[PDB]
Amino acid sequence: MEELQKSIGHKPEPTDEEWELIKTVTEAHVATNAHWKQKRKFLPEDIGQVDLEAFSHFTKIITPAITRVVDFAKKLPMFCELPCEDQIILLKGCCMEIMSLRAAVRYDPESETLTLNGEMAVTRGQLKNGGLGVVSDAIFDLGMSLSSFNLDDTEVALLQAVLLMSSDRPGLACVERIEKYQDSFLLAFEHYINYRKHHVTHFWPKLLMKVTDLRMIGACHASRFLHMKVECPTELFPPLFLEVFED
Numbered sequence: 531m532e533e534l535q536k537s538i539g540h541k542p543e544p545t546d547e548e549w550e551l552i553k554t555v556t557e558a559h560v561a562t563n564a565h566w567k568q569k570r571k572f573l574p575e576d577i578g579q580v581d582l583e584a585f586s587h588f589t590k591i592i593t594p595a596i597t598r599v600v601d602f603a604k605k606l607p608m609f610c611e612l613p614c615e616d617q618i619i620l621l622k623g624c625c626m627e628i629m630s631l632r633a634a635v636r637y638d639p640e641s642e643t644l645t646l647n648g649e650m651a652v653t654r655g656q657l658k659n660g661g662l663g664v665v666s667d668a669i670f671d672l673g674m675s676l677s678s679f680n681l682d683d684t685e686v687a688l689l690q691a692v693l694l695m696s697s698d699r700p701g702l703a704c705v706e707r708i709e710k711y712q713d714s715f716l717l718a719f720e721h722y723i724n725y726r727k728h729h730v731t732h733f734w735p736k737l738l739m740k741v742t743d744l745r746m747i748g749a750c751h752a753s754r755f756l757h758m759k760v761e762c763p764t765e766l767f768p769p770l771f772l773e774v775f776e777d
C-alpha cells in the first residue's frame with residue numbers, strides 16, 4: 531500500500547475514506563474559525579509599548595479562544611470516542627498550540643500584525659508586553675514562515691488535528707489508540723498535500739518541522755503562564771484560562 535507507492539515515486543492523493551475525514555476536520559475548523567482581513571480592529575499604540583492594560587484586552591478574548599479549540603475537538607468524532615480523562619489532558623496540551631497556529635496564519639506583512647480571533651489585530655510588541663513575552667516573537671516568526679507555504683483551511687485543519695491527537699502527553703490511558711488517530715490524520719494530510727501540489731521543494735518534511743515549532747510555542751507558553759501568574763493579579767484571569775493551563 532503506502533511504502534511501495536513511495537518506492538515507485540507515485541505521490542498518492544486521498545482515498546474516499548480519507549476525503550470523508552478531510553471534509554469533517556475542515557468543516558470543524560471552518561465553524562470554529564470566523565472574512566478575517568477587513569473584520570479586524572487594531573488595538574491602539576498606547577496599549578503595549580507585563581502591561582496590565584494590554585493584558586486586560588487579551589484576557590477578554592482568551593475565554594472565546596479556549597472554547598473555539600474545545601468546540602473544534604468536540605466536532606471531531608475520534609476525539610469523542612476517547613475518555614474524559616484523556617480528552618481533558620489532550621485539550622490542556624494542544625490548546626495554545628492550536629491558538630498560536632491560527633494567529634500565525636492571520637499575519638499581514640504590510641502592517642506587521644497577527645490578527646487574534648479574527649477581530650483583535652496586534653503588533654509584535656503588544657502581544658509580547660501584554661503577556662506572552664518571547665512567545666510573541668515565535669508566533670510572529672512562525673506567521674512569517676507560514677505565509678510562504680500558503681496553507682488552505684484544510685491544511686490548517688488537518689495540522690490542528692495532528693496537534694490534538696498527541697499520544698506523548700502525560701497521564702494518557704489510551705496511548706496506542708491516539709497514535710492510530712494521529713497516523714490516519716498524518717497519512718490523509720500527506721495525501722491532501724499531494725492533491726494540492728505545492729511548489730516548495732521538500733514541502734511535507736518542512737511542514738512537519740512547523741509541528742515541532744508549534745509544540746515549542748506551547749511549552750514556552752507554559753513557562754510564560756507561571757510568570758503571568760506572578761506578574762499579574764489573579765482577578766484579571768478568567769476561570770477557564772486558569773483551569774486549562776494550571777498543573
Ligand SMILES: CC(C)c1cc(Oc2c(Cl)cc(-n3nc(N)c(=O)[nH]c3=O)cc2Cl)n[nH]c1=O
Binds near residue numbers: 594596598629630647
Ligand atoms: C497574554 C495571554 C492572555 C495570552 C494571549 C494569547 O494570545 C492569543 C489569543 Cl488570546 C488567542 C489566540 N487565538 N485563539 C483561538 N482559539 C483562535 O481561533 N484564534 C486566535 O487567534 C491566539 C493567541 Cl496567540 N494566547 N495565550 C495567552 O495566554
